[PDB]
Amino acid sequence: MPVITLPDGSQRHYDHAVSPMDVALDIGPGLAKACIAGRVNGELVDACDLIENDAQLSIITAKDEEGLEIIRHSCAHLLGHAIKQLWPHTKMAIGPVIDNGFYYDVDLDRTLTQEDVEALEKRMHELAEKNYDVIKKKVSWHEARETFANRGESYKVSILDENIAHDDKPGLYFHEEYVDMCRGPHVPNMRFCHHFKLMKTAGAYWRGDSNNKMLQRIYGTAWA
């Protein structure tokens, strides 16, 4: 029966687990509509993550620097969703939110030209405008490995083999037919990711090792 304490000290008593989105809705329609994620006992969580016990909660919106960072991170997922449609055999490596933007390192035999990047951004806009829900699922290490192995995503598989413990539960984020892996949080719906643009591309060695393949780093930025 969690007691949720908000930043101003107000408390909400519940007799069942509730997510940040559930609480936002209880507070009001405006806050629920603005809700991107939550901070529970100091840690960022997705808006759909259940809060089982008494906790301090803060609702994250686009007015928070954290909300902007989450929007940027989900735009990296959007880039993957789009690039996988334009060039299906593209392999996804790492795509983080960085200062002032985001990027995604990709393995594609085709060297992307300015026109290709423009085509990629165009598809991203079309997909984001569909306002689809981002579906999160926490799975076992092996379940995540099989998901990516079946998609031929060798870099994601390498990440599981070398950088994620067998006892950790990878977070999978589904964007329609596209799936990515992350600690998140990510936006609850792509309606929060309509304002972005792709910039330039650069070369980036996988794992920073010049003996490994030089991937194409696609930079972008987003705002809200």
Smaller CB distance to ligand SSA: residue 39 or 175? 175
Phi/psi of residue 157, nearest 5 degrees: -65, -40
Least distance to ligand SSA, CB of residue 95, Å: 4
The site that binds ligand SSA (CB under 6 A) totals a number of residues, namely 17
Asked if residue 6 lies in contact with residue 58, where contact means CB atoms within 8 angstroms, the answer is yes
Kindly identify the residues of this chain, within the stretch 94-133, that bind ligand SSA according to CB under 6 A: 94-96
Asked if residue 201 lies in contact with residue 219, where contact means CB atoms within 8 angstroms, the answer is yes
Token output for 156: 């994601």
Smaller CB distance to ligand SSA: residue 46 or 180? 180
Q: From CA 97, how far away is CA 74, in angstroms rounded? A: 9
Least distance to ligand SSA, CB of residue 195, Å: 18
Q: How many CB atoms lie within 10 A of CB 176?
A: 14
Smaller CB distance to ligand SSA: residue 58 or 158? 158
Least distance to ligand SSA, CB of residue 114, Å: 23
152 backbone φψ class: left, alpha, beta (φ>0; ψ -120 to 50): left
Identify which of 196, 201, 202, 170 has the alpha carbon closest to the alpha carbon of residue 78: 196
Least distance to ligand SSA, CB of residue 43, Å: 13
Smaller CB distance to ligand SSA: residue 4 or 159? 159
Kindly identify the residues of this chain, within the stretch 68-87, that bind ligand SSA according to CB under 6 A: 73, 76-77
Smaller CB distance to ligand SSA: residue 39 or 77? 77
Token output for 78: 């959007």
Token output for 69: 């960072």
Q: Which sign does the torsion angle of CA 180, 181, 182, 186 carry? A: positive
What is the pattern of x (binds ligand SSA, CB under 6 A) and - over residues 144-183? Answer: ---------------x---xx---xxxx--------xxxx
Smaller CB distance to ligand SSA: residue 96 or 194? 96
Q: From CA 58, how far away is CA 205, in angstroms rounded? A: 39
Least distance to ligand SSA, CB of residue 28, Å: 31
Identify whether 96 is preceded by a cis peptide bond (ω within 30 of 0).
Answer: no
Determine, following the binding rule CB under 6 A, whether residue 51 of this chain makes contact with ligand SSA: no
Residues that bind ligand SSA (CB under 6 A): 73, 76-77, 94-96, 159, 163-164, 168-171, 180-183
